[PDB]
Every structure is written in structure tokens, then in C-alpha cells.
Design an enzyme around this catalytic site. Structure first.
Site, short mmCIF file in Angstrom:
data_model
loop_
_atom_site.label_atom_id
_atom_site.label_comp_id
_atom_site.label_asym_id
_atom_site.label_seq_id
_atom_site.Cartn_x
_atom_site.Cartn_y
_atom_site.Cartn_z
N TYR A 41 0.83 -1.19 0.00
CA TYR A 41 0.00 0.00 0.00
C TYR A 41 0.87 1.25 0.00
CZ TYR A 41 0.91 0.56 5.04
OH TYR A 41 1.50 0.74 6.27
N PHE B 128 1.64 10.18 3.66
CA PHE B 128 1.75 10.00 5.10
C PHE B 128 2.15 8.59 5.50
CE2 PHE B 128 -2.18 7.62 5.77
CZ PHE B 128 -2.92 7.95 4.65
N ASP B 129 2.10 7.61 4.60
CA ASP B 129 2.38 6.23 4.96
C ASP B 129 2.78 5.48 3.70
OD1 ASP B 129 2.69 3.89 6.34
OD2 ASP B 129 0.58 3.67 6.91
N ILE C 95 -9.03 0.08 8.50
CA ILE C 95 -10.18 0.98 8.42
C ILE C 95 -11.24 0.42 7.48
CG2 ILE C 95 -8.79 3.00 8.97
CD1 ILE C 95 -8.78 3.57 5.91
N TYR D 26 -11.64 8.23 9.59
CA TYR D 26 -11.29 9.13 10.68
C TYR D 26 -11.98 10.48 10.64
CZ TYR D 26 -7.47 5.90 11.85
OH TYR D 26 -6.74 4.80 12.20
N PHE E 225 -5.23 6.05 -1.67
CA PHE E 225 -4.34 4.92 -1.49
C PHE E 225 -4.09 4.22 -2.81
CE2 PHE E 225 -6.23 5.41 2.71
CZ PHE E 225 -5.10 5.42 3.50
#
Length: 107
Positions: free
Chosen positions: A26, A36-37, A56, A82, A99
Site C-alpha cells: 500500500y 503519510f504512509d 479501516i 477518521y 491509497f
């Protein structure tokens, strides 16, 4: 409201089911924002199973609607991950998430 944008190649038949631990390269992306990731940084491609509410809701619905080798593109709505709360310091409240998801798994 998960909308799948699959880049074609894969098999189109190995769909994930319950009790199946799967492996995903991912990458986190913020809409009107930066990354961010990323699993590609640590290069440990995030072994996880389906159904135990680990991930999530937007990523969980997008995982079952892919197959082996496919490369989709998520657009996570705020209300499923979120957008009421926001992860403190990392995710602001009412954020829409992007994503790049590839399923290269087992089981």
C-alpha cells in the site's frame, strides 16, 4: 462510498475471503496533501487478514473488491476511517484519503 479504480493486470479471480491473510504494497496519500504512509519504505509488505476489523472500513471494503496482482486506487470517504475524529497529528478531522493498493498475497 468506496470507488475502485483498478489498473488492469492481475488475474481477476483470486478474491480475498474470510480467514485469509493477505499481503499489500500500500501507499498512503492525502488528497490536497502529501504522503503519510508507505509499506515500500520499510519494505515489510504488511501482512494482515480480512474480517477482524484491523484496518479501516474504506480499506477493508476495497481489499475484498480486488484480486491477486491487481493494482487499484482507493478514495476513502471521511466517515469510514477518521473524518469524525482524525488521527492526532497525522490525520486532520474530515479528511479524504487516497491509497495506491496492490494485492500480491497468499491465501
Amino acid at each position: 462510498g468506496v470507488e475502485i479504480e483498478t489498473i488492469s493486470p492481475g488475474d481477476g479471480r483470486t478474491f480475498p475471503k474470510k480467514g485469509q491473510t493477505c499481503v499489500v504494497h500500500y501507499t498512503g496519500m492525502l488528497q490536497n496533501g502529501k504522503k503519510f504512509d508507505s509499506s515500500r519504505d520499510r519494505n515489510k509488505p504488511f501482512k494482515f487478514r480480512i474480517g477482524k476489523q484491523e484496518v479501516i472500513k474504506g480499506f477493508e471494503e476495497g481489499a475484498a473488491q480486488m484480486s491477486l496482482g491487481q493494482r487499484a486506487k482507493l478514495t476513502c470517504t471521511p466517515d469510514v476511517a477518521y473524518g469524525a475524529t482524525g488521527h492526532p497529528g497525522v490525520i486532520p478531522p474530515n479528511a479524504t484519503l487516497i491509497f495506491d493498493v496492490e494485492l500480491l498475497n497468499l491465501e
